[PDB]
Design an enzyme around this catalytic site. Structure first.
Site, short mmCIF file in Angstrom:
data_model
loop_
_atom_site.label_atom_id
_atom_site.label_comp_id
_atom_site.label_asym_id
_atom_site.label_seq_id
_atom_site.Cartn_x
_atom_site.Cartn_y
_atom_site.Cartn_z
N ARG D 13 13.26 4.55 1.44
CA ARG D 13 12.15 3.74 0.96
C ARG D 13 12.01 2.39 1.66
NH1 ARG D 13 12.98 2.81 -4.94
NH2 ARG D 13 11.79 4.74 -5.29
N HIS D 59 0.55 5.28 -5.44
CA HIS D 59 1.53 4.26 -5.78
C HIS D 59 1.13 3.52 -7.04
CE1 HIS D 59 5.17 2.36 -4.49
NE2 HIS D 59 4.66 1.15 -4.53
N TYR D 103 -12.61 -10.10 -4.52
CA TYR D 103 -13.47 -10.63 -3.45
C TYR D 103 -13.45 -10.02 -2.03
CZ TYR D 103 -13.80 -14.02 -7.23
OH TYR D 103 -13.95 -14.61 -8.46
#
Ligand SMILES: [Zn+2]
Ligand SMILES: [Zn+2]
Ligand SMILES: [Zn+2]
Lengths: 55, 505, 251, 475, 374, 47
Positions: D13, D59, D103
């Protein structure tokens, strides 16, 4: 069968020869207990969900 | 003086912190639910992981990294927060003690049946949509609900200048009150109350005094006290009394209650408690309090009512958004606005169904006359290499008409689209591009002999349908009858025993 | 402290030998456990791991409650078997990185400050089912891949007992492939055609559990809390020393 | 045992995979963007959309990880070759935070699309997600050596990594040079790949470190800022302005440390320190006392200030699932053979697809011949199932199922035009040309590697750019 | 999170105050060194949740502002920047950062607002992009003007058959009158239904002289409600009536509509007819139904389509304009790149900027109190 | 044109009558200042 003292590192051996297993002295044992109480005992965060907005 | 900007802020904040009275939901509720609807996370279809719904929601309707979304999803699943849950959850969804729900990647969820009744005719142009934060998605301004919800699940929130605090009610009773309204508009509060005695709590418990309830339903505002269903049980052999508590007021935290009791006996503000234990398990809630030899059970009990949330005052303040503004409204006002919504909902519903059946009628007619006129069209399209040329040839020439008889036989003036212009269609001369495409894209699997029969019969069916729809739009009384049978179906589907006791004085 | 109300869900049974304690991961199986258990014999303490400054740690409020709830002393010298409130203590946590941290530290507190509670065998780890298979009117919970494999082949069949022997032999040979006269007997004796047809005839809804917070209270109860049909492992001193090895590795 | 397993999980990982040099996060982000259709030719999408689905599908933990990863793949100062085109505020080298996930707008880079080409052709293996309702690519079918090109960094305690980013053209040329001849020397590769090229322009001080690093797999090499020192011509005074600074260094924290060292007297001879960095260009101004010497100040800074930093290069990455240390040649080789398997798989898929499509096209054209004979036959039986049960030449011979009958039945009347005959015929012949070419490619490995060379030429031409960092060696 | 500047002359320079997460990196990487100085501030400070404005930040801000605290120590000659652009997102989040800045001014440096030193930033609400064309229009006003601009760009009205096609300034004037009048009609939707007022512009006028008779008024209202009935789409029935006045024997129309079930009346009194609103409604009225005939054409650029009325015409025009492009409404400053932020809201030549009055600051303070009061 | 003192609440008339507007005395002004320093001018929003 000796395992290191998790406070000072003094290699002390298992058995009745040590009454503070796995510590060498009780003061270190007490210090470790204080650390547990003081939350001195941590495991650093890995690079298990964190929310950016939350706190 | 409240200025222009100020009122802006006051408007958006409230609009986020109070519900519309029609579906009884705040923006985040709607967004979560509708997202679960688009995702097809249905009630009899298998569960999905709490994560996916959340991701979709953040992406489409709520672009913040806020547990807000998963917290909302969760609350809807907890039996002890919603009277009638809108989310079927599997896994560990927390506890009344205050235990948190498992990570959003473990716990799985799917809309509840009542949730589907909350969004029934949503695709039938039933209520306005509105833009999302990037304008690339639409989100329902209201829900075409078939359940009162506001009155049923209640609403609680705090805002800039006002807050709302409506308790949940038993669905069965509320539906009954709705029916009684319909049959008797001009009805009276005393009358509605014949069907709904007062609030219903998922926790259960008891409610002390009807006066507050009454004042609330009359005005919109009223304070009513919820007492816990505690009991004192006396052990026969030793005579040693032991209280026991089986239910507790709505929104009260078990842990904080128990801690408060322990604090109260440590500070010696209440005495006569030998032990304090939490024996709650799969059998249900129980809280055991053991009275000392010295003490009298009932006395200890009343102290635990006086100094704890074993009895608590719920302040009813029924505020909700009437149209785009917030307004305090009594029970009748609420039921009335639900119902108006139903009048608007079912009307828009029937107009949509209308348009659908009319278009289907047009196209099915085209397919009919195509089946009747099969060889020459096969040839004409045979010859033309370009599909557009074949199309123009199809439109250019009207064609003729077991197919024709029923077209004439089962025609009013209208099966026609409301948009059809006068020129097109049926002197025994078919005036005909849309339909040309409809037959240009016709499959070969259809050319079997009985598929016509199927299409005819389907056309007759659609005619019966448009007949019933026109019948339903024609008479307002009929509309009301439909709504009554709908509500009756609702309370036949989900109807729950009263859970909270009401005792006068 | 004296009072464990509000933080501990104690059981009815006061006699420690007949009762058990459950140290669960709070943000995992806490609320579920507090709703699945049996109030007669089972007490429950939820736990969490806090985050401050820059990770997971066992908090002061909790240790004091933990120690109080256990009732015995701190340090090998102080240990008192009669003060001990429960003979069975279960560390019910997930297997992830934080689930390992809460548990292991749990042992580590134990290894350092209550080592006797590990050597007396009082502490028991809890083991939940890994598989749930539901063809789709019925379902069953499967404990280990071994039982999962045996279940899978036993149903994969639906030929004789000799076929069971043959497929077991073939599985043994394939295990040998993964890891002589055996392989020669097979080579002298396609096969995978029929076998794979069996595979397609058998395979339902397969679910692998990754956390405790996938299970309903009743489910958690039936699967790893109910005294019948449960499963748990008695940790040795070696397990505790290994936990302390992990801790010292991560400091 | 268990600790070792946790040991392994952490390695899996926190380390890249040599074929694409991507961690699970990167791959999941990019693939989510891919399936989302977040293309470079189509308009932007708000970051919140991507993240959201990353959380929902692949995820699900916190935005924290998943939007940060996206922000990294967009900053010019963070990645050599960018994987995300981002409109909006995406942070600053001074450590300014990128704007809200609400944004900022993003879309895959052209380069990023080249990272995922030929994915749908069953090229690389897929694997399950948590929920198990979706499949995620274990590795990407990249036409880019983005491992070497974008580098990496190792989180993990114990094995950790610090591969630096390189120049595209140089690595492509090196790869072609490896294609030409196996067993190519490392020093022969350093002829094509002079060293690592950073997104920030800078100077590399020692090439001995570079050499040892490329050969051993490990090494230490110093990155040096491009500071420039300069007098005011008639005033007889000096001023130092830095123009560029080493990879992964905050300008703000740098100048802050300079202020610290000045305040603590640890560095002396600086009259004024200022940051005149702007849109026209980075520049950090360090005005010199008269008493001091510019260059000696400039070297004192090089020493204790992070103007110059020791970059410890290490190349631990996942090979066959196991964390291994690798040569330049080892990585390049792994990349190449990966591409071999890629081209092989995708060409096999194209072959099978073309075969099936030609089968269907055949049946269709038969239906275009046997029209009237069929139409009656199918009209007789009232049931399409019963009628289904009831169910040019020169060229098939010349250029050489019930589901076919179903594909014939499921055909529109629009298809029975005069033009569709010629259309499907030309498509058929072109498909025969295609299967001929594909078989020709599968047969000879030389032509396969030659087309691979063609694609790499395409890559080095299109996306290739200049070199940004300077390499000086004076020992 | 500290300032930067360049020029020392206070009149020649300016000071931005910008949120750190939305426009810190934007302003820094897009600023002009010479005259512009910006301060990065974070508008949500950790507490243990997220909320406020920092004490350290406050001190830094006072120092940056430069001139003194309270009315006493104010010193015009020591203010370091004579223009102080509160450039903050302006949703409620941002509005709060901005407000704290305005409230603090109002209380502790009222002078700086009174002397009109505190100007606020205004970014472009919108961004339009068709193929090649990319452009920024600042409000909803310019958005409407642009909308009609491209709606009429190269297009013309064929009124009767093929007659002298209408376009140019005349068409723009007519459409302008139409949209303005429909703004008046929009406003009135609280008093009378909108459709009824649009048919009020298409149907003939009704003077008070006509109100002196009955059959003409009844004829008028009948034609109106009948037209509304047949042109109805949403299933709403229209009826009519004429109430009788005792004095002077005047008559006034009444429009009854069963909207869902809600039979509702809408009377048209004399003062409405004489008022002036109905006069404008009738001017545009004459001007337009006096006009289109039949067999008429509206066409823009290359393409054409026949059209029953003005409405259909204008609707087809906007449809024809909107076909190619889409539009974005800018909500946050973090949406823009440094180059865009510079070209749009910061460039001293292109920027729209607002100067605050003492009443503005006072309003911000009343907002602050009201919010702090909760 | 009178404004209320944001510290003590006493009404102070706008205009040069008082040099401390919108505050009534300098002690109110300074108090407010320290409040701005002590991080006590905060705005709490929830949900
Ligand atoms: Zn020691
Ligand atoms: Zn806001
Ligand atoms: Zn005062």
């Amino acid at each position: 069968i000796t395992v290191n003292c998790p406070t000072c590192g003094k290699t002390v051996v298992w058995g009745e020869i040590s009454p503070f297993r796995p510590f060498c002295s009780k003061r270190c044992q007490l210090i470790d207990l204080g650390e547990w109480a003081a939350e001195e005992k941590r495991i650093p965060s890995s690079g298990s969900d964190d929310w950016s907005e939350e706190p | 003086l409240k200025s222009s900007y100020l009122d802006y802020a006051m408007s958006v904040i409230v609009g986020r912190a109070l519900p519309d009275v029609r579906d009884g939901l705040k923006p985040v509720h709607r967004r979560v639910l509708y997202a679960m609807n688009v995702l097809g996370n249905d009630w009899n279809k298998a569960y999905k992981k709490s994560a996916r719904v959340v991701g979709d929601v953040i992406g489409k309707y709520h672009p913040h990294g806020d547990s807000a979304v998963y917290d909302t999803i969760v609350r809807m699943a907890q039996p002890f927060s919603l009277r009638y849950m809108l989310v079927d959850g599997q896994g560990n969804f927390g506890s009344i003690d205050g235990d948190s729900a498992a990570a959003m990647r473990y716990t799985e969820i799917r809309l509840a049946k009542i949730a589907h009744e909350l969004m029934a005719d949503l695709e039938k142009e039933t209520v306005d949509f509105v833009d999302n934060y990037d304008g690339t998605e639409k989100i329902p301004d209201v829900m075409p609900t078939k359940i009162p919800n506001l009155l049923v699940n209640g609403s609680s929130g705090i805002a800039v200048g006002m807050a709302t605090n409506i308790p949940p009610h038993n669905l069965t009773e509320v539906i009954n009150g709705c029916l009684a309204y319909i049959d008797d508009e001009d009805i009276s509060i005393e009358g509605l109350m014949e069907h709904i005695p007062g609030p219903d709590f998922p926790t259960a418990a008891i409610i002390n005094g009807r006066r507050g309830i009454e004042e609330a339903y009359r005005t919109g505002r009223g304070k009513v006290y919820i007492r816990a269903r505690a009991e004192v049980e006396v052990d026969a052999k030793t005579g040693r009394e032991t209280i026991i508590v089986h239910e507790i007021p709505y929104q009260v935290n078990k842990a904080r209650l128990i801690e408060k009791i322990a604090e109260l006996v440590k500070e010696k503000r209440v005495e006569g408690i030998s032990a304090l234990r939490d024996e709650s398990d799969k059998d249900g809630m129980r809280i055991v309090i053991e009275v000392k030899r010295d003490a009298v059970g009932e006395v200890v009990l009343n102290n635990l009512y006086s100094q704890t949330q074993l009895q608590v005052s719920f302040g009813i303040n029924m505020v909700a958004l009437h149209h785009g503004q917030p307004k305090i409204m009594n029970l009748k006002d609420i039921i009335a606005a639900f119902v108006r919504h139903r009048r608007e909902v079912v009307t828009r519903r029937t107009i949509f169904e209308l348009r659908k059946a009319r278009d289907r009628a047009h196209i099915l007619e085209a397919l009919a006359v195509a089946l009747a006129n099969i060889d020459p069209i096969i040839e004409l399209i045979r010859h033309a290499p370009t599909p557009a040329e074949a199309k123009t040839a199809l439109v250019a020439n009207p064609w003729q008409l077991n197919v024709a008889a029923m077209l004439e036989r089962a025609g009013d003036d209208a099966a026609r689209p409301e948009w059809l212009e006068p020129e097109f269609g049926v002197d025994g001369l078919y005036y005909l591009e849309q339909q040309a495409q409809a037959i240009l894209d016709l499959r070969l699997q259809k050319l079997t002999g009985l598929e016509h029969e199927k299409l005819l019969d389907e056309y007759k069916e659609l005619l019966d349908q448009i007949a019933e729809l026109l019948r339903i739009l024609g008479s307002a009384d009929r509309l009301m009858e439909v709504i009554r049978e709908e509500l009756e179906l609702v309370r036949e589907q989900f109807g729950d025993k009263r859970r909270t006791e009401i005792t006068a004085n | 402290l004296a009072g464990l109300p509000g933080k501990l869900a104690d059981c009815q049974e006061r006699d420690p030998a007949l009762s058990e304690l459950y140290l669960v991961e709070g943000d995992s199986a806490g609320g579920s456990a507090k709703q699945g258990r049996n109030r007669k014999n089972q007490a429950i303490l939820p736990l969490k791991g806090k985050i401050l400054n820059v990770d997971k740690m066992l908090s002061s409020q909790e240790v004091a409650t933990l120690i109080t709830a256990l009732g015995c002393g701190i340090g090998r010298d102080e240990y008192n078997p009669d003060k001990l409130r429960y003979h069975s203590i279960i560390i019910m946590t997930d297997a992830d990185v934080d689930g390992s941290h809460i548990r292991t530290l749990l042992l580590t507190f134990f290894y350092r400050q209550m080592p006797e509670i590990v050597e007396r065998g009082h502490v028991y780890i809890a083991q939940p089912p890994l598989y749930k298979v539901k063809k789709g009117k019925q379902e069953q919970y499967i404990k280990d891949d071994e039982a999962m494999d045996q279940y899978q082949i036993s149903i994969a069949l639906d030929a004789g007992e000799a076929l069971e022997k043959l497929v077991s032999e073939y599985n043994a040979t394939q295990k040998m492939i993964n890891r002589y006269r055996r392989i020669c007997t097979l080579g002298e004796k396609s096969f995978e055609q029929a076998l794979d047809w069996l595979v397609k005839e058998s395979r339902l809804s397969i679910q692998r559990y990754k956390g405790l917070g996938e299970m309903n209270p009743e489910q958690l109860w039936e699967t790893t809390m109910d005294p019948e049909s449960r499963r748990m492992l008695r940790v040795t001193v070696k397990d505790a020393i290994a936990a302390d090895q992990l801790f010292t590795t991560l400091m």
